[PDB]
Amino acid sequence: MNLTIPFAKGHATENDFIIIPDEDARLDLTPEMVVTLCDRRAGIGADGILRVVKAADVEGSTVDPSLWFMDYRNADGSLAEMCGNGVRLFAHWLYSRGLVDNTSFDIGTRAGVRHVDILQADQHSAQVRVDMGIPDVTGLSTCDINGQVFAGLGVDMGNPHLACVVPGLSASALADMELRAPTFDQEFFPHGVNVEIVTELEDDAVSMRVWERGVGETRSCGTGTVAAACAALADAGLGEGTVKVCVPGGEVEVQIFDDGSTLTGPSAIIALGEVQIHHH
Amino acid sequence: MNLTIPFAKGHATENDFIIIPDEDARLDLTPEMVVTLCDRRAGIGADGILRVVKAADVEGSTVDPSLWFMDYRNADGSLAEMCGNGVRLFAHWLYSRGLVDNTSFDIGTRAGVRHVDILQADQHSAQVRVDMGIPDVTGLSTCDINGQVFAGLGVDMGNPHLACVVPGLSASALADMELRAPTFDQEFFPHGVNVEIVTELEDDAVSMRVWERGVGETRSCGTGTVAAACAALADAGLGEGTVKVCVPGGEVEVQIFDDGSTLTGPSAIIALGEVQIHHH
Ligand SMILES: N[C@H](CCC[C@H](N)C(=O)O)C(=O)O
Numbered sequence: 001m002n003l004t005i006p007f008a009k010g011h012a013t014e015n016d017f018i019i020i021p022d023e024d025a026r027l028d029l030t031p032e033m034v035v036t037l038c039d040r041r042a043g044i045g046a047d048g049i050l051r052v053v054k055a056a057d058v059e060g061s062t063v064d065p066s067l068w069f070m071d072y073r074n075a076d077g078s079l080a081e082m083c084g085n086g087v088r089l090f091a092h093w094l095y096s097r098g099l100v101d102n103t104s105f106d107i108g109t110r111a112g113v114r115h116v117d118i119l120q121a122d123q124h125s126a127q128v129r130v131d132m133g134i135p136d137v138t139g140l141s142t143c144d145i146n147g148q149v150f151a152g153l154g155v156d157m158g159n160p161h162l163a164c165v166v167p168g169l170s171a172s173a174l175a176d177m178e179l180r181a182p183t184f185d186q187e188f189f190p191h192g193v194n195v196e197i198v199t200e201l202e203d204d205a206v207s208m209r210v211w212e213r214g215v216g217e218t219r220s221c222g223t224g225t226v227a228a229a230c231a232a233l234a235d236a237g238l239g240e241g242t243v244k245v246c247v248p249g250g251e252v253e254v255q256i257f258d259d260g261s262t263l264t265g266p267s268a269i270i271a272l273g274e275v276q277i278h279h280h
Numbered sequence: 281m282n283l284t285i286p287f288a289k290g291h292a293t294e295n296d297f298i299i300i301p302d303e304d305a306r307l308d309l310t311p312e313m314v315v316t317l318c319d320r321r322a323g324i325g326a327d328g329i330l331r332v333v334k335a336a337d338v339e340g341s342t343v344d345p346s347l348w349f350m351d352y353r354n355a356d357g358s359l360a361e362m363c364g365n366g367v368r369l370f371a372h373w374l375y376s377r378g379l380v381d382n383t384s385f386d387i388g389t390r391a392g393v394r395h396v397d398i399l400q401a402d403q404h405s406a407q408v409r410v411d412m413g414i415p416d417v418t419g420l421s422t423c424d425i426n427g428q429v430f431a432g433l434g435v436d437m438g439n440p441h442l443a444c445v446v447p448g449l450s451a452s453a454l455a456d457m458e459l460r461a462p463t464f465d466q467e468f469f470p471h472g473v474n475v476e477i478v479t480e481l482e483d484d485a486v487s488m489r490v491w492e493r494g495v496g497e498t499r500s501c502g503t504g505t506v507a508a509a510c511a512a513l514a515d516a517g518l519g520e521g522t523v524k525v526c527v528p529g530g531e532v533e534v535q536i537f538d539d540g541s542t543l544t545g546p547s548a549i550i551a552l553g554e555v556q557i558h559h560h
């Protein structure tokens with residue numbers, strides 16, 4: 001006995017999502033079902049899910065009930081407290097379908113409210129700026145990736161990061177290295193952690209790869225790019241700045257003040273349809 | 281300037297396809313476009329494409345123009361001469377949408393005509409039997425996978441195979457081994473080759489993994505299962521038989537006579553929609 005769910009597919013710097021419209025709040029998917037859908041072969045395939053729902057109808061939220069809420073699920077069914085690339089696609093979706101009518105608006109997330117600015121938008125593409133709030137640098141920790149250690153900044157962007165700027169690493173060296181789920185200090189990161197490997201600041205740019213909690217390597221990670229841009233700035237001895245972060249799925253521009261931070265990048269809406277899945 | 285293409289997503293033992301309806305024969309996709317679509321993040325994601333077209337309107341075919349033709353493309357844009365799992369999903373599609381009206385019919389492929397029998401069918405599931413023709417054992421060759429050599433049968437099933445039955449290998453040992461694109465004799469396989477690693481016959485069953493030409497590891501390979509079932513039977517000293525082949529995405533039953541061979545397995549239709557893609 002299978003359900004038929006309307007959906008759209010999209011990405012933001014090739015970090016890709018399945019959008020489930022759910023204003024009547026009748027598709028709070030179980031984690032098994034999330035897994036099934038984010039399986040490319042068995043389902044559709046994605047890095048995770050954006051279920052579109054009002055804050056009024058989302059369990060555990062206490063943000064303004066009148067806002068749209070970005071119910072993000074990771075590909076393993078795991079919840080997460082924020083998703084930078086997600087927020088951009090979610091904004092793109094809402095605007096482009098006329099579910100809001102300003103280029104500038106607030107969205108609810110599991111880390112609270114996030115403001116967005118639509119800079120450019122079609123049916124299929126957009127550029128979105130996100131107020132990401134203040135990066136809270138949590139301390140210093142390390143990880144091991146494939147019997148080699150790196151030292152990083154803990155950063156809280158809503159969710160946890162370990163941003164390891166690597167002294168001397170070229171971009172081509174970085175493209176080459178082979179990643180395995182890192183191992184980290186579980187007292188420091190009791191809930192798991194997103195890890196970013198980063199090149200040092202140069203021409204106001206860094207290059208990054210990332211091993212997402214819940215998911216594995218992704219072609220981009222928006223909260224992680226901001227984490228990386230802190231780390232790169234801190235390693236150059238600044239704490240304000242504008243940094244272009246280069247990820248396997250593209251480019252974003254992060255901006256860091258003392259009062260806050262922003263993440264500006266593209267978003268794309270690739271497909272619409274309906275999908276089959278089994279309850280059991 | 282982007283095209284909007286109606287499509288369906290489906291699989292056959294988790295070897296998954298994008299179905300493009302194209303009776304007016306106006307979507308002979310270029311290989312770049314195939315690649316874009318079979319990219320999960322950038323497009324939809326699949327092991328390959330089944331474009332649905334009449335034999336009349338397919339370049340290079342000389343089969344009966346009145347038949348439906350399975351225009352199969354691999355995920356790298358590469359054409360291929362047959363696709364076993366594809367044929368089952370293609371039959372499922374045609375029947376279930378009422379584009380044929382018999383449970384038993386002929387389909388055109390790049391290896392010529394293939395007969396099919398629909399055994400069970402819904403909107404969403406089916407069991408299909410395929411007349412695969414005669415396995416032609418081409419000789420003996422070897423390959424290397426990750427600095428280790430295996431010896432195999434060359435088999436022509438339409439397309440080329442190297443079926444390596446491995447003396448002593450358990451299923452759990454097989455689940456464990458780590459695969460890399462094999463290296464093979466290019467005089468023997470001037471066009472590339474599908475490689476199957478197989479366990480010895482036991483309880484009329486073998487277990488198999490496969491590194492598809494054009495694609496890489498797949499959860500199943502229908503022509504390869506028949507290749508594997510020959511090899512396993514030959515290594516047990518028979519040349520007729522009924523063999524259950526176990527693949528990471530499930531199970532199929534292959535049957536071998538002297539007059540021919542059949543492949544019976546499941547098929548599923550997971551989603552319908554429309555997708556965006558760029559000409560340039
Ligand atoms: N790709 C997302 C990250 C999702 C976070 C999730 N992987 C986690 O914290 O577990 C981003 O744009 O920020």
Ligand SMILES: N[C@H](CCC[C@H](N)C(=O)O)C(=O)O
Nearest residue numbers: 360363364365492493502503
């Ligand atoms: N998965 C397909 C194999 C496609 C063959 C293609 N990989 C090639 O010959 O290059 C099958 O069911 O037989």
